Amino acid sequence: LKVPPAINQFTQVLDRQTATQLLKLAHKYRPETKQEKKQRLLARAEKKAAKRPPVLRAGVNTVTTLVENKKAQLVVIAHDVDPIELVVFLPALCRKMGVPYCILKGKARLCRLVHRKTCTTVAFTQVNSEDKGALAKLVEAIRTNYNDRYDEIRRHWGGNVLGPKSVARIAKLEKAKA
Amino acid sequence: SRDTLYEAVREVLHGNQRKRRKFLETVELQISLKNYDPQKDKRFSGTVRLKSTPRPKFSVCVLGDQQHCDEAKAVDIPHMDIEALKKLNKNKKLVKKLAKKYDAFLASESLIKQIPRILGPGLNKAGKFPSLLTHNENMVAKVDEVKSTIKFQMKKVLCLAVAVGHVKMTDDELVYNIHLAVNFLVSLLKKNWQNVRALYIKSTMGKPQRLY
Amino acid sequence: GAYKYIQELWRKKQSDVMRFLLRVRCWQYRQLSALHRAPRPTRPDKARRLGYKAKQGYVIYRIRVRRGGRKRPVPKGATYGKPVHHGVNQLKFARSLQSVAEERAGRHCGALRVLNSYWVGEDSTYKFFEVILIDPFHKAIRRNPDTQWITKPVHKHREMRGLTSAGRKSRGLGKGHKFHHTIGGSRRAAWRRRNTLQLHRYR
Amino acid sequence: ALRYPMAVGLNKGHKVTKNVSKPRHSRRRGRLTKHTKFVRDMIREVCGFAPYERRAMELLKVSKDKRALKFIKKRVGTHIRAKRKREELSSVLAAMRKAAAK
Amino acid sequence: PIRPIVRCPTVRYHTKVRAGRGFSLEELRVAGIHKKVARTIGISVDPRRRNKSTESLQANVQRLKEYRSKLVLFPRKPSAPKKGDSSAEELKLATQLTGPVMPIRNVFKKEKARVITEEEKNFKAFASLRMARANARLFGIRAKRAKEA
RNA sequence: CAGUAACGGCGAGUGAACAGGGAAGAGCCCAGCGCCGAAUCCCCGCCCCGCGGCGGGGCGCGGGAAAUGUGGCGUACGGAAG
RNA sequence: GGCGCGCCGGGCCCGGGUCUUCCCGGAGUCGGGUUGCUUGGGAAUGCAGCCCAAAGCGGGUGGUAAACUCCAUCUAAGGCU
RNA sequence: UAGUCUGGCACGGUGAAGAGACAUGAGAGGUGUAGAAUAAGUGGGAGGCCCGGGCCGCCGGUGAAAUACCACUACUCUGAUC
């Protein structure tokens, strides 16, 4: 089928070399596990009975609301959202609002950043002073790749590739007149 | 009849980065059309009323038995007698000399007729029609009709173009050099169906700026 | 908030994006059975509106219902009546195909309660509706004090007595000058009142 | 003269000093705010136009305006909607012409 | 609870007064009662009622000032009183009320016999009716012909 | 109201509603928009009271649901923050 | 069975008036064309099939089809009682 | 009136060979007496240009606008297409 560029743009996915560098940076700014939360509440009583860190903003609603607000430094999107209407627009939003964005393979991989099964979108709202440089060299090679090719992406129809034996019948007919 | 309307009656503004001028100029408007028949009974005329200081430039004149010999020889009234204008119409076909030395007249008060024989009427089919407003408010009473309503002539280009402003009259006062002009472009608008295509609000020195 | 985007994106149905999506989904839906289960809503945003939460005990069934009108099931197309009732072909069913999809979802899943239904695509011979059903005996629903209205026996088989939204649309009730034939409870209550002779004991 | 308040004519009915308030918050529904204007203009850019909008648009590039109304009307339904639809489509087309030169 | 004063609609009836459904929020507002406290101290509340007139309003504001003066209020814990409550004198003299609270009766003004003015006798009330009828009928095209003129 | 306005080979026939007086009287909640570290929910295993409507408490790096959005605030009578 | 003083267990630690500053909404649904039934509802009261299908200073209603124009009145397509 | 025959709309797509388009970037393009000159022209214009002089001019000379002096839209061939 003749697939439209808004849907098809999710098949231009981030490269293996960059995606490894990206998940190495993303792995330091995890949300806390549900069991990690309680040992933080163990560390309450030493002033009470006797300043919050950067994480990945998870979910689509709570990444969409901080793309429109100019509060996302890089937005990571999964390529394989089951109904695609959930995520179709975030390319357009991030480009228009001037947010650098990349598309990764595996919502299961991006959901293993958080401590759930799947997570469609994952944003970098802030990072720490010593990990500024890694985010800086990511946004360089990602913003040149996606956000600046956007007039190119918007006019690019995917699909429309016939079966290999229908192609091989055409090629036989083509060399039959030569 | 009406093809266009305005609500964002703005966007003249980006002017100083265009115009870096010193000397004598006068900014003019280019405003292109479509669908006019130059062969038919289809007319397009009028004189569109800007009382906010636009500048035509011409061979001057000023008429009238006023207090003219006191007031109107500040910019020099060269008052030739209305009986010494009999030459202008009788030296037309037997003589071959352009006997004007004139391109702009008056319409005076204190006299309530101009000259009701064939010398005042006489200006009906020469162009440069004596029309102007100086009468008995006496605000400027001379330069009102240079600072006047802006004139156009419909010809074999089926286009409208007309002066807007002077190298003077700042950009908050030259936004007001179309304000009582584009409303008369929908008022006295005849059966010249779907006319306007380009509204280029022009600062002469710079870029073609468009306001559609 | 993404749900505002998905709402408006689902309104542009004759776009490039949606005219593709609706076509490949209407393909997919033909290649399953007429009455089967979905593991999540096709349209998460639309179910949000019509009263779905994403907790345990909320079920989504996907029912296909055959398009077209209703022909009078009389043998050899011959009604034994006066020429008024010679109608066979061009008759129409007084309930909608959305309400028919609700009552098949409900009848099959007898132990669940039909909340609402929404259109997820149509065909030439089929319409597809995703119906929200709730398990009334699940403690997630049973211990939540704002969704334990459905755990009373009055809301048994709402789809069949016509209390659902697509059901209600068939009865022709509402306030004002247009709904004067269902004053009181319903169409029958109005008929009963206006035809009941009130013989007072004194007269 | 004296003029009695009468029950028939132009200024009829019982004269009363009427207090004028703010309308209720129900009356302001269906008013375009900046945040929801944003969303419609984004999903215009994502999607595009319907095959009847494009057909009525390429009628208005050729300037068959009456036939553009008649087409939008027979597609959408009634006059007032087709009037508002053409007034919007022509403004989209005039913004394209603002992008044509620059 | 107490029902407000309301005019019957439709010219046949608008010379009468009923009991309304409930007190408008802009009558509670200018009377100084909260819309969620009003219902708990026995005042009917309608959120649908508009106020076109200021006399329809002002009658119903003076209705609530009389009601809030008449009202005896018991302590929420009967042994320890609060500020907005009544005195133990009134609490022991407090009684069940029979019938509709501060009932709505329909009183008309008293016009003393006056001497008829020389103009008052002169006024042509029938001709005024007839020429008010024609001014209402023909006005529309009188404006049209005057526009075309 | 009223066998009325209206329907009807305008034939036979059919046929409501508003206003008015009472009987009764009672009001509300989501989604959405947004902020609160999912602050939310279900279930197993051990202990104690103690429940012929299976509920409260302690305990667990026990298991799951859930960012494809649970709970709190909040809904057209306006709402929220300072 | 029902209720009140109070002993006693648990939780909840919560108000209003005025300005400044943000925000505001249910779509193959309204709507239109046609067809069948229905209605007291008559150039079509309600319901349904099929085709076309929106808007946001919008939309609905204003018992005669339609255009232009003021005015009134509600906030549909989610839910409980 | 069932059925059958026939037309329209919907599911319903993709591609090459063969016209008018217009979105759209161009290049050719014009002959009234009459003037020394194939006037596509308006709001301009005594002036602006390139090595201080020139430059095209001015006047009249044809006519209700006239040749140098920012830029535009149009009409008749031509002409590339995401």
Account of the protein in words:
Chain A: Component of the large ribosomal subunit. The ribosome is a large ribonucleoprotein complex responsible for the synthesis of proteins in the cell. Chain A: GO terms for molecular function: RNA binding. The structure is cut from a larger assembly and holds chains A (178 residues), B (212 residues), C (203 residues), D (102 residues) and E (149 residues). Helix content of chain A is 37%, strand content 11%. Chain A has helices at 5-8, 16-26, 36-42, 61-64, 90-96, 107-111, 132-143, 150-153, 164-174; strands at residues 2-3, 56-58, 74-78, 101-104, 121-124, 158-159. The two termini of chain A are 31 Å apart. Chain C has eight helices and four strands, in the order ααβαβαββαααα. Chain D is mainly α and 102 residues long. Chain D is 58% helix and 0% strand. Chain D binds chain E through residues 1-2, 4, 6-10, 12, 14, 16-19, 21, and chain E through 11, 14, 26, 51-55, 57, 119-120, 123, 125, 128-129, 132-133, 135-136, 139. The structure holds three RNA strands.
Topology, element by element:
This is part of a larger assembly, with chains A (178 residues), B (212 residues), C (203 residues), D (102 residues) and E (149 residues).
Chain A: E1 2-3, H1 5-8, H2 16-26, H3 36-42, E2 56-58, H4 61-64, E3 74-78, H5 90-96, E4 101-104, H6 107-111, E5 121-124, H7 132-143, H8 150-153, E6 158-159, H9 164-174
Parallel strand pairs in A: 3-4
Antiparallel strand pairs in A: 1-6, 2-5, 3-5
Helix pairs in contact in A: 2-7
Chain B: E1 26-31, E2 47-48, H1 68-71, H2 87-90, E3 150-151, E4 160-166
Chain E: E1 5-7, E2 17-19, H1 25-31, H2 55-70, H3 88-92, H4 125-148
Antiparallel strand pairs in E: 1-2
Chain C binds three RNA strands through helix 1, helix 3, strand 3 and helix 8.
